[PDB]
Nucleic acid binder design. Structure first.
Lengths: 136, 175, 112, 50, 86, 44
RNA sequence: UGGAGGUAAAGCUACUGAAUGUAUGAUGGCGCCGGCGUACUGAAUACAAUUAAACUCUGAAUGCCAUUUAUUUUA
RNA sequence: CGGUCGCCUCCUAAAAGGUAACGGAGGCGUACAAAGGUACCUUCAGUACGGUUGGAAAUCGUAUGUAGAGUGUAAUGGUGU
RNA sequence: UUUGGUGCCCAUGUCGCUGUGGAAACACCUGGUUCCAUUUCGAACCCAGCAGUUAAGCACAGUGGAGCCGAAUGUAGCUGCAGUGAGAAUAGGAAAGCACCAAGC
């Protein structure tokens, strides 16, 4: 999949993030971005699924970047186990998403193909796809 | 004595040849450092007596060793572990040893084809490094068991390497 | 770089500040400059950033050995009654005619 | 539980005078400091009396 | 059903000696009163402030507590018992 | 203080370099064959 | 009103750490002949934007203690 | 029972601080007769240059950066004569 | 006030450069010539003087450049749902300023 080198803490809290979009409200080097209508904790499986679906339905001469890479860790507990004993277990690393952050920034391929690519990634991504233009 | 002779005629000649806004931007010398880096003294070469003794022999100031800059495992030393010996040279002793350095040590340099190796740091210093500790008749090759010399250094208050080069050119030192 | 003067100044300032801090009741400040020709002394009161009196070849007691270079300023300060001063040891270390000058304060009222 | 302080007594009256921390590693020996004693009211060289 | 459950880490909040602004601006403070409690010299005593053998700041003499920013960035904080009459 | 170092003179054989100066206290007049103009490139 | 926070928040080339094209691109993959740029490892900055309770260059309101006019009650 | 029984470093814990948790981050059960005091002196580590071994670091002489060195600690901040 | 002492606010004022005044004072310099000191000695430290100097030590104008600070609105925060108002960005700023003593006055 897509994996970070390390996380800041092995078992970070699922802490609430009330506020607004910090950092990425746009793309950094692409021409469009798959921007979500929500901010949550997402894993690398959907990241890879959406990214490779986008690349498959795009062309070649365009360039690809992932902006908000997975940076923190996810702590999830198995099921059918009684509540207690603190937190769960460290698992798949997580990319923190805020209200307006962009996962994938792409460039140099026909534009409507970019819109379609982000839509079909929204099919492969838990969030409702949102289209974003070129910014920096 | 080279001291008064230089300070009277040669310093003035250097000042008037390439002039400044005064006659104290002349090539200035704060001191003369004589050095014997012996780090294998801890590794049992001669247990630090060689550097102290021979520098004291070629000293004008009481020899004080300096603590190491770092702590390294390939040459054991930590929290001090003074390696080698170091002597500063002030007052009379500066020119007292410059006379022997320029008149006696210079022709005895094995690689003496013009000492302009550009050992300047561009920071107003000139770092003469010789792998032959036998450069003065003030030392006999029986103190240490290694190829050894000195990293002596001419120093300047106002940092200008050309000033040290001018000092070198005017003291019978071929370039 | 250094011209053997700003080291004296930096030592002198650090020590006068530390000694002023030793006594919470700040007195008149005796800062003395060991110049190469003579020795100058100034009564900096560290409450207004001003000077009360001075003694040097221009102020009083022409070039310093001459223990009166400190005696006159101490006499001026006992006309001000700020004795037991926060006496700076000086960046120039306490030797030479300064040994005459510094104790010249003690013999002339400054009971530090 | 265990103690790093030391119990020190005056060498002129044998009373127990001082209880202060005491380096036990690099100074395992009994401490002999010249500090104030009360039954004579003056600085005397106390010794470990126990 | 319970026959054993996962352990608990040494991860509960560490409580220190009670510290904070024991005195505030505008009120007279008296000598010996604990004006500030710190663990390590970070907030610096000014004038007429005593530091005991706990890094505990009390009033050497009477005055008013004052917290001032100074230095090259207004980041350094000095606590000082400025000489206000008792 | 460094143990006292006294005046030493010099004498050469192929250059006759005579110079007196304060230096190491094991020698009074250093007589040598190579000093001054004796090295092949000491000239200049 | 005073004090300072460091919560929220922008930002993290302002740091702690992951991160990306772009800049030198050493340096080692890879060959080359002490010589050489590298299919890639590729430092950190210039530049580019990031992620974050245990990150804070900054950075509030609120809150907090003191402050003075002040009101309740015989507590 | 797992785990626990004394104490401290960060935060969730909502800005003085605090802040609950079967909440996630580390340990301690001490260390200096100097690491106390007085006084005087005294600094960055690093990095760089050029240099007897000495190589990247020792080594000298500097420049350099001005706190990322150090300061007893676990972590925190703090500390520029 | 020219110029010597340095407090005091900070990166605007931190740095860099163009330079300027030094005539007395000042700094280097003359030397280790004693007092004094070097964790090592004339490098300080001490002496007792300035042949010399504006370069540096000192001070004085500019260099808005590196760099600082970063305005208003808005923006999150905030939390009667708008203000409240960050940050951050821009404008612009600043090349220091705040004084005494002392001689050149």
């Amino acid at each position: 999949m897509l994996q970070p080198k390390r996380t800041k803490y092995r078992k970070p809290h699922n802490v609430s993030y009330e506020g607004k979009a910090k950092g990425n409200s746009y793309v950094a080097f692409g021409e469009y971005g798959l921007v979500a209508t929500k901010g949550n904790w997402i894993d690398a499986r959907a990241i890879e699924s959406a990214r490779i679906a986008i690349s498959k339905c795009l062309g070649k001469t365009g360039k690809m970047w992932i902006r908000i890479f997975p940076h923190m860790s996810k702590t999830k507990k198995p099921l059918e186990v009684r509540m207690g004993s603190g937190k769960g277990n460290p698992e798949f690393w997580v990319a923190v998403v805020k209200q307006g952050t962009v996962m994938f920034e792409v460039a140099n391929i026909p534009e409507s193909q970019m819109i379609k690519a982000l839509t079909r990634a929204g099919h492969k991504l838990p969030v409702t796809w949102k289209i974003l233009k070129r910014e920096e | 004595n080279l001291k008064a002779h230089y300070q009277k005629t040669i310093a003035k000649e250097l000042q008037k040849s390439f002039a400044f806004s005064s006659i104290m931007q002349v090539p200035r010398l704060e001191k003369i450092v004589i050095n014997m880096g012996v780090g294998d003294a801890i590794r049992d070469s001669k247990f630090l007596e060689s550097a102290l003794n021979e520098l004291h022999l070629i000293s004008g100031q009481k020899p004080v060793a300096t603590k190491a800059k770092n702590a390294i495992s390939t040459y054991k030393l930590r929290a001090g572990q003074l390696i080698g010996c170091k002597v500063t040279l002030r007052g009379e002793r500066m020119w007292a040893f410059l006379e022997k350095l320029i008149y006696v040590a210079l022709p005895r340099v094995r690689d003496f084809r013009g000492l302009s190796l550009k050992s300047f740091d561009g920071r107003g210093n000139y770092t003469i490094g010789i792998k032959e500790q036998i450069i003065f008749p003030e030392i006999v090759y029986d103190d240490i068991k290694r190829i050894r010399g000195f990293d002596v250094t001419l120093v300047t208050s106002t940092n200008k390497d050309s000033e040290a080069l001018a000092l070198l050119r005017a003291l019978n030192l071929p370039l | 770089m250094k011209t053997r003067t700003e080291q004296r100044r930096l030592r002198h300032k650090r020590i006068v500040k530390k000694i002023r801090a030793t006594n919470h009741d700040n007195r008149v400040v005796l800062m003395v400059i060991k110049s190469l020709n003579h020795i100058s002394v100034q009564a900096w009161d560290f409450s207004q950033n001003i000077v009360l009196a001075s003694s040097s070849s221009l102020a009083l007691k022409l070039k310093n050995n001459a223990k009166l270079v400190g005696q006159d300023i101490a006499d001026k300060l006992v006309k001000l009654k700020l004795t037991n001063v926060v006496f700076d040891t000086g960046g120039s270390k306490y030797h030479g005619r300064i040994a005459a000058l510094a104790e010249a304060a003690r013999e002339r009222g400054l009971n530090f | 539980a265990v103690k790093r302080s030391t119990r020190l007594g005056c060498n002129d009256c044998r009373e127990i005078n001082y209880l202060t921390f005491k380096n036990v590693k690099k100074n395992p020996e009994k401490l002999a400091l010249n500090k104030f004693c009360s039954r004579c009211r003056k600085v005397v060289v106390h010794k470990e009396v126990k | 059903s319970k026959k054993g459950v996962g352990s608990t880490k040494n991860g509960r909040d560490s409580h220190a000696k009670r510290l904070g602004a024991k005195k505030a601006d505008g009120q007279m403070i008296r000598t010996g009163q604990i004006i500030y409690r710190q663990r390590g010299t970070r907030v610096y005593p000014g004038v007429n402030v005593g530091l005991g053998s706990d890094d505990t700041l009390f009033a050497l003499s009477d005055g008013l507590v004052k917290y001032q920013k100074f230095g090259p960035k207004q980041g350094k904080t000095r606590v000082s018992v400025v000489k206000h009459k008792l | 203080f460094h143990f006292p170092s006294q005046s030493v003179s010099f004498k050469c054989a192929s250059c006759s370099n005579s110079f007196t100066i304060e230096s190491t206290l094991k020698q009074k007049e250093i007589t040598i064959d190579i000093c001054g103009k004796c090295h092949p490139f000491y000239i200049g």
